[PDB]
Amino acid sequence: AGAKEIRSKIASIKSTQKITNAMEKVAVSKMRKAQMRMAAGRPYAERIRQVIGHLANANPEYRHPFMVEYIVVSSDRGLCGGLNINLFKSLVKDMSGYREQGAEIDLCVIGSKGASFFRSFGGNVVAAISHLGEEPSINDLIGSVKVMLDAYLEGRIDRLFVVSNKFVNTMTQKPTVEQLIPLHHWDYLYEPDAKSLLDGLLVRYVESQVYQAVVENNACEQAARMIAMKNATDNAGELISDLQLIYNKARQAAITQEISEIVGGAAAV
Amino acid sequence: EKFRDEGRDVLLFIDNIYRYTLAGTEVSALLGRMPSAVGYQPTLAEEMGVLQERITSTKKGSITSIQAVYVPADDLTDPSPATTFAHLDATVVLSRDIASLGIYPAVDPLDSTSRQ
Amino acid sequence: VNAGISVSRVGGAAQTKIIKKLSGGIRTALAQYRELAAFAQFASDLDEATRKQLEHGQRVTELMKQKQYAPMS
Amino acid sequence: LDPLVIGQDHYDTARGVQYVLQRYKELKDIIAILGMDELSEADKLLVARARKIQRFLSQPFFVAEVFTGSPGKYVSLKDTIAGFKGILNGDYDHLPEQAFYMVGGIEEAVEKAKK
Amino acid sequence: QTGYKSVDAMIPVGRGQRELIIGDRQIGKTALAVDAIINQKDSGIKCVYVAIGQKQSTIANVVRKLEENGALANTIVVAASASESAALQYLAPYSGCTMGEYFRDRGEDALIVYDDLSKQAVAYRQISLLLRRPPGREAYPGDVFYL
Amino acid sequence: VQPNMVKVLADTVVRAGDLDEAAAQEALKAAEKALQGKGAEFDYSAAAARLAEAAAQLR
Ligand SMILES: Nc1ncnc2c1ncn2[C@@H]1O[C@H](COP(=O)(O)OP(=O)(O)OP(=O)(O)O)[C@@H](O)[C@H]1O
Numbered sequence: 001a002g003a004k005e006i007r008s009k010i011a012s013i014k015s016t017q018k019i020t021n022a023m024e025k026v027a028v029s030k031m032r033k034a035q036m037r038m039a040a041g042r043p044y045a046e047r048i049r050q051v052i053g054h055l056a057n058a059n060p061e062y063r064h065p066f067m068v069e070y071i072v073v074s075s076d077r078g079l080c081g082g083l084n085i086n087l088f089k090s091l092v093k094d095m096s097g098y099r100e101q102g103a104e105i106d107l108c109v110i111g112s113k114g115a116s117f118f119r120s121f122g123g124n125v126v127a128a129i130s131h132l133g134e135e136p137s138i139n140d141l142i143g144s145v146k147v148m149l150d151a152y153l154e155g156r157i158d159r160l161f162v163v164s165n166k167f168v169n170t171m172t173q174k175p176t177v178e179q180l181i182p183l184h185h186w187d188y189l190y191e192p193d194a195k196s197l198l199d200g201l202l203v204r205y206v207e208s209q210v211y212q213a214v215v216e217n218n219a220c221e222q223a224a225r226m227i228a229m230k231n232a233t234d235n236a237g238e239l240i241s242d243l244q245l246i247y248n249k250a251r252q253a254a255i256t257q258e259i260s261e262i263v264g265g266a267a268a269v
Numbered sequence: 270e271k272f273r274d275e276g277r278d279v280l281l282f283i284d285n286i287y288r289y290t291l292a293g294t295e296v297s298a299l300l301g302r303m304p305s306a307v308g309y310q311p312t313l314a315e316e317m318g319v320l321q322e323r324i325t326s327t328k329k330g331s332i333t334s335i336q337a338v339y340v341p342a343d344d345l346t347d348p349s350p351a352t353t354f355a356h357l358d359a360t361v362v363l364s365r366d367i368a369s370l371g372i373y374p375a376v377d378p379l380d381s382t383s384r385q
Numbered sequence: 386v387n388a389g390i391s392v393s394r395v396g397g398a399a400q401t402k403i404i405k406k407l408s409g410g411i412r413t414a415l416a417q418y419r420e421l422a423a424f425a426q427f428a429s430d431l432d433e434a435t436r437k438q439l440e441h442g443q444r445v446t447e448l449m450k451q452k453q454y455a456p457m458s
Numbered sequence: 459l460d461p462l463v464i465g466q467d468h469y470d471t472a473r474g475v476q477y478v479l480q481r482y483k484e485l486k487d488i489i490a491i492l493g494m495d496e497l498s499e500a501d502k503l504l505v506a507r508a509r510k511i512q513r514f515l516s517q518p519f520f521v522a523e524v525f526t527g528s529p530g531k532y533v534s535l536k537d538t539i540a541g542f543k544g545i546l547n548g549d550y551d552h553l554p555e556q557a558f559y560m561v562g563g564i565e566e567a568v569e570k571a572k573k
Numbered sequence: 574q575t576g577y578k579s580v581d582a583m584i585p586v587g588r589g590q591r592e593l594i595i596g597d598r599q600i601g602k603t604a605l606a607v608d609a610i611i612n613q614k615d616s617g618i619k620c621v622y623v624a625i626g627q628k629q630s631t632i633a634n635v636v637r638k639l640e641e642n643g644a645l646a647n648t649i650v651v652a653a654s655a656s657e658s659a660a661l662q663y664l665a666p667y668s669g670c671t672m673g674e675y676f677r678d679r680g681e682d683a684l685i686v687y688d689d690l691s692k693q694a695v696a697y698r699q700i701s702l703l704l705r706r707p708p709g710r711e712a713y714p715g716d717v718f719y720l
Numbered sequence: 721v722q723p724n725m726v727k728v729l730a731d732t733v734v735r736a737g738d739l740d741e742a743a744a745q746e747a748l749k750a751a752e753k754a755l756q757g758k759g760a761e762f763d764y765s766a767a768a769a770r771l772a773e774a775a776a777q778l779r
């Protein structure tokens with residue numbers, strides 16, 4: 001219609017571009033916070049692996065079910081660079097292999113986008129929790145984890161796997177699936193009994209690997225959001241650049257028309 | 270032109286080539302001629318060509334010219350910038366950012382260009 | 386030359402047989418590349434089919450590059 | 459394009475195709491800056507049917523086989539209505555978008571989707 | 574044959590065709606057309622090059638490159654430079670076309686290049702607005718299509 | 721405990737089973753939905769490719 005409307009659209013796109021610029025830097029800061037919370041849980045995991053290892057070896061008479069022959073993590077906010085889709089595309093691929101092999105599948109959903117993917121396709125679920133803070137605590141995962149550990153004990157599930165993105169790098173978020181269940185010289189003094197302790201250690205170890213997974217996926221959410229907000233800022237500029245060319249054409253065209261009208265009237269009067 | 274005929278290489282500095290175009294628009298309006306696109310004089314390309322075609326390398330000497338350029342409404346498609354750019358062999362851009370760094374020449378190595 | 390919008394209305398009937406037959410697989414490759422060129426940097430992990438098309442697309446594009454004052458027979 | 463001239467079935471198929479494309483045109487700016495993934499579940503479904511409808515409106519002509527080389531297609535009014543009615547109802551939601559481009563009748567899209 | 578694999582394989586030109594070379598400034602529009610003329614030094618197609626509103630130094634460089642490449646003996650060069658009268662710039666394409674038509678009417682083949690058809694339109698607009706003829710879109714005369 | 725090193729793998733809350741037991745029922749409660757389905761729901765790969773392609777165009 002004219003030059004008036006295009007100015008409002010160039011101003012509209014310029015305002016949105018400045019906030020998406022900040023959101024990329026906010027996201028980078030939050031990514032660094034989630035990466036230190038990732039490292040403050042490695043000691044509890046590497047030492048318990050050594051204890052669960054040696055304690056089984058010195059006590060061969062007990063072979064916990066977890067040691068002999070899906071939990072899915074999703075975001076609570078948008079702006080991700082298809083991070084939820086890429087994992088949900090690996091969840092569907094592995095589930096297919098089992099449906100072809102003939103096995104049934106029960107599911108645990110952590111986060112909002114996981115629930116959306118299942119309500120949108122009428123999928124089954126046995127446990128679910130969302131609204132976990134950007135800073136999660138292991139206590140929230142205990143309830144959801146318990147519904148899954150008992151299954152494996154009651155035979156309601158033959159194998160348990162955690163589905164989460166892994167923080168390969170600042171530019172890479174590898175979707176992956178790993179099996180949670182099933183899994184020197186001297187010997188330890190056991191209080192009260194070795195069997196009593198092995199049962200306690202194995203639950204602490206599975207609830208630990210699940211917390212490790214949630215926290216890493218939050219770091220992936222922040223990085224993915226950084227790239228998405230960079231893309232949005234760049235795309236906005238391209239629209240601003242294209243509209244500016246149309247505005248210059250509208251500006252030049254308006255001037256020629258007025259001059260013709262002035263000249264036309266003066267050529268009569 | 271006189272120094273070039275002497276056997277020299279000469280520098281011709283033009284303070285602003287946009288003001289040469291505008292003076293032509295003003296004179297064309299005073300003489301009553303019918304205005305062209307965006308209100309410029311109908312003789313816009315010929316008036317630029319008459320000036321710019323004398324600045325060349327002859328078989329005796331060579332007049333090289335440095336001309337400051339102004340862009341109306343920041344539009345590079347406007348008739349004045351469009352016509353002038355058709356006769357330019359190089360573009361030197363001076364940057365306010367580079368000056369803050371402390372490089373006094375202040376020529377932008379990425380935005381500045383040459384057909385040579 | 387922008388192979389997307391450049392076109393010859395009567396050129397088809399003018400090409401020699403050799404160029405008319407062999408050129409069949411050149412324009413199609415550039416078209417297949419047009420849809421993948423920007424995304425190519427993160428297409429190394431995509432389906433093998435997409436990678437074959439992309440490999441060919443990056444090759445044909447490179448071959449079309451030529452120099453000034455150097456005509457081929 | 460009147461119910462009293464062409465019948466309700468043809469008039470509804472056309473009204474439905476136009477309704478779908480109009481909404482897709484309105485969503486263009488949001489997808490341009492944020493992409494298709496931020497849209498609602500229903501909007502994503504329409505954007506998918508709008509795209510298939512767009513390519514099923516394409517047709518190779520008998521006066522264009524010289525330009526392209528592919529053979530021309532003549533589609534009856536009956537086959538035209540059946541193809542778009544099927545895409546709007548969702549009977550073809552399992553085919554890739556590129557199975558509808560230059561395929562003449564809908565059966566050819568089903569056979570194009572096999573590759 | 575233009576001698577360019579991209580053009581000769583995807584955008585072929587036949588004898589008697591009108592093929593437009595379009596784009597922004599400084600992209601190789603002249604380069605492509607001059608190489609197409611150089612490739613006709615052995616084909617038997619006589620060539621004509623019309624320079625409209627160009628710099629004298631640019632015209633001189635093209636003539637040297639044509640003689641350096643052995644193509645000047647088959648080429649006719651028609652020049653109306655940036656400081657010449659608008660009337661001569663507006664008429665140069667018709668003069669070059671008339672020289673090219675000499676070969677087509679006698680059963681021979683010819684190739685003609687118009688270096689800037691957009692500069693011919695600017696020259697014709699100047700003459701039209703100086704005869705006080707009503708202007709249209711972008712201030713061009715009503716018969717600019719017919720030009 | 722080892723001769724050289726002493727590690728305390730400390731918990732962050734009361735680990736009474738009842739609390740986790742309640743926690744599990746609370747998670748089970750949140751998992752209840754109007755359309756639980758059969759358990760053989762599939763064929764999302766077409767949609768996953770459709771969105772994946774749009775996400776390529778976005779960057
Ligand atoms: N194949 C090529 N290889 C290398 N350089 C090339 C090639 N084709 C064109 N160029 C370069 O492109 C530049 C511009 O070319 P040219 O002057 O012909 O473009 P133009 O569109 O006609 O410009 P102008 O608007 O000034 O007339 C020149 O420096 C030329 O050498």
Ligand SMILES: [Mg+2]
Binds near residue numbers: 602603604688
């Ligand atoms: Mg040129």
